[PDB]
């Protein structure tokens, strides 16, 4: 039960965005959004990861082996932040699109 | 016998309760007040009746090492509670003389120290919340006290919203508790005052 | 609101239990039998506390007339002659004077003799 639905189960970020790490570890490191999971609040950035070993009863002469793969994340990160660091961007508006909004803090480029 | 912070004068009225600040009556008053607020909500299955159980058991005499009637009794597990809480009230009317003697005795209890009456709230300038911090700093409120504001004028109250500094009490709806709880009482609006 | 018995009983019990030490078997281990051992234990405590004084009385005396007899008198005779002399209100624990220091006790004997005939 419970589970990640504390937010409105909406994502402040998008699938194709560059994003950095607010606090946490690998502080301020950045990367492209890869996996965006809204319900469970999970984000995969190209940036941060682990070395995870595979238990493999059958894989290509199964003989199990180790891989190095990406650790998923919470809402903790900073989402598409232009002026060379992370900051909270609320504001919306229209620029070239009647049907579309955009995002900024002090600036207007995401 | 007290000053106003902006504009006029007055507050030389209001003979204060005698003797000055009797805390027994105070205690009586607040205790009554919390008691008034107290909302009885009782989750208890008291009776062997409340909980769900079929009631005839097994042999009385002759089973041995036994002795029981039913599974719903309080000497059992899962069963009813003997003397658990029920949905009551505990709200009464404290005699009115003391109801009005109290708050007066509180205001009186603010004459060993700081209290304030104000007029001319126009120094607030809409709300902005900032100008309340200003108004405070100029009127001597460090915000290292706890403050209660009693006034009308929604513009003037709504300037104050925060946990640290202040709390707000409209239309002279004052509580002996609320004012005795906070450090500074700003009696502000001089309507109920004087 | 309810108050579960939690950590209250346990504490008390643990205290009782700790009072039980070199107690044999069940006594030292499980509560009830410990506690109820400690009732009779009370009885013997206070009563023997009033008692050990009767006990030591007995012991000291039992030494004193022993030495007296080594010198030719007895407790009856020795304290009779000693106290017959307003000289000795000496009394208490005098046993160790008979035990440790013989010559002294001898002098007290002869004193008890001069206080007789």
């Amino acid at each position: 039960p419970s589970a990640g639905s504390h937010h409105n189960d909406k994502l402040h970020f998008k699938k194709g965005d560059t994003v950095i790490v607010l606090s946490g570890k690998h502080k301020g490191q950045t990367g492209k959004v890869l996996l965006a999971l809204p319900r469970d609040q999970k984000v995969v950035v190209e940036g941060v990861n682990v070395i995870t070993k595979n238990v493999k009863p059958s894989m290509t002469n199964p003989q199990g082996g180790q891989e190095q793969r990406e650790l998923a994340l919470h809402a903790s990160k900073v989402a598409l932040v232009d002026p060379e660091t992370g900051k909270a961007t609320r504001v919306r508006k229209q620029i070239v699109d009647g049907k579309k909004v955009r995002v900024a803090v002090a600036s207007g480029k995401t | 016998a007290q000053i106003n912070v902006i504009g006029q004068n007055g507050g030389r009225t209001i003979e204060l309760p005698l003797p000055e600040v009797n805390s027994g009556v105070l205690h009586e008053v607040v205790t009554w007040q919390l008691a008034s607020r107290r909302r009885g909500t009782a989750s208890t299955r008291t009776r062997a009746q409340v909980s769900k159980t079929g009631r005839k058991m097994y042999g009385q005499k002759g089973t041995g090492n036994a002795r029981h009637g039913d599974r719903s009794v309080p000497t059992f597990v899962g069963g009813g509670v003997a003397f658990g809480p029920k949905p009551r009230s505990y709200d009464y009317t404290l005699p009115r003389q003391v109801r009005q003697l109290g708050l007066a005795m509180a205001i009186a209890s603010r004459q060993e120290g700081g209290k304030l009456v104000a007029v001319d709230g126009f120094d607030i300038a809409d709300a902005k919340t900032k100008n309340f911090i200003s108004w405070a700093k100029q009127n001597g409120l460090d915000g290292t006290e706890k403050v209660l504001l009693v006034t009308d004028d929604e513009n003037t109250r709504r300037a104050a919203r925060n946990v640290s500094w202040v709390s707000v009490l409209p239309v002279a709806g004052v509580n002996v508790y609320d004012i005795l709880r906070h450090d500074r009482l700003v009696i502000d609006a001089a309507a109920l005052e004087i | 609101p309810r108050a579960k018995t939690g950590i209250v009983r346990r504490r008390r019990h643990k205290k009782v239990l700790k009072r039980a030490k070199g107690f044999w078997g069940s006594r030292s281990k499980q509560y009830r039998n410990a506690f109820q051992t400690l009732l009779n234990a009370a009885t013997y405590e206070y009563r023997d506390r009033r008692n050990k004084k009767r006990d030591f009385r007995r012991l000291w005396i039992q030494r004193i007339n022993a030495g007296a007899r080594l010198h030719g008198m007895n407790y009856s005779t020795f304290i009779n002659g000693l106290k017959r002399a307003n000289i000795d209100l000496n009394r208490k624990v005098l046993a160790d004077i008979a035990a440790r220091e013989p010559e002294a006790f001898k002098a007290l004997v002869d004193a008890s003799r001069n206080a007789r005939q």
């Binding site: - | 805390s23 027994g24 105070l26 205690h27 009586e28 607040v30 508790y177 005795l180 709880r181 | -």
Partner: protein
């Protein structure tokens, strides 16, 4: 300050718990534990066997208005038919009656529903009038 706020100093004592008390096992040994039947009265013991009837009525009852009250203090505001409610007879429910208790000479004129003998024999000897409904 609520935390420096004291007690009543002797309004209440704590309640009564019969749990514990190391040798409390409460009430009476046999007989009269457990029951909701105690019941001090009842026809059994010396109430019946007691011999009365008479009969119940309790008809008209009147406000007792002390003379001492009326005289002495106030103004002799000439009590009459209305102001009297503020004079503390307060009843309604019943008519008003005047009786003689205190003595002071005064001119007084009062509307009540009835009065006693030495009442009218008092009010007039000091001068005055006492009205009665026709």
């Amino acid at each position: 300050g609520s935390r420096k706020d004291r007690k009543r100093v002797g309004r209440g004592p704590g309640g009564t718990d019969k749990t514990a008390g190391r040798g409390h096992k409460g009430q009476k040994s046999r007989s009269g534990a457990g029951k909701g039947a105690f019941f001090e009265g009842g026809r059994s013991r010396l109430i019946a066997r007691l011999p009365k009837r008479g009969f119940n009525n309790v008809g008209t009852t009147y406000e007792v208005v002390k003379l001492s009250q009326l005289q002495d203090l106030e103004d002799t505001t000439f009590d009459r038919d209305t102001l009297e409610a503020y004079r503390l007879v307060r009843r309604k429910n019943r008519p008003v009656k005047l009786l003689a208790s205190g003595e002071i000479s005064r001119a007084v004129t009062v509307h009540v529903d009835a009065a006693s003998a030495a009442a009218i024999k008092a009010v007039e000897a000091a001068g005055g009038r006492v009205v009665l409904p026709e």
